[PDB]
Amino acid sequence: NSFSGYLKLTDNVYIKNADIVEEAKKVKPTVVVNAANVYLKHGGGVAGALNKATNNAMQVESDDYIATNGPLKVGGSCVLSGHNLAKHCLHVVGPNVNKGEDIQLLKSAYENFNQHEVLLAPLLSAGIFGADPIHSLRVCVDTVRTNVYLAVFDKNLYDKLVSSFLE
């Protein structure tokens, strides 16, 4: 959990312009969060990047979890192996606004982070899931009380997010 160079937004929320895959390799975190869907099919966005960085080990483990336990619910999570990226991967399902899901469940999705004293995470329901990323950061700040280190790949979004907090 060697986190450094994050902007400290609040007492417990940190943000950095970084690829979550590269941060995970650098930081060696206890927990990396996946922006998952309910059947843990890691096809695109953050999930695709994390799975490809494990050379599909995450997808094989995820398929076994689903076969045995069935799909997650929106706002839910499970803990699986972090493989080479982290000790654990917390797979968290935020609502997919682009596929017509409800923004109230974004708070429930972020509540899962409170089970872990420190996490490396993406912004939930952002990118291809279609939520306003600045709203997602506000929900994170209001909901998560443990130490969350947010990786935002796109420097422009990072600067927009920091500006919404500082200006």
Ligand SMILES: O=C(O)[C@H](Cc1c[nH]c2ccccc12)Nc1ncnc2[nH]ccc12
């Ligand atoms: O820049 C990117 O492509 C993604 C976009 C994103 C933010 N939240 C998500 C939730 C689900 C799907 C996509 C997104 N953001 C990233 N942030 C940090 N590291 C990353 N590695 C790959 C994408 C990415």
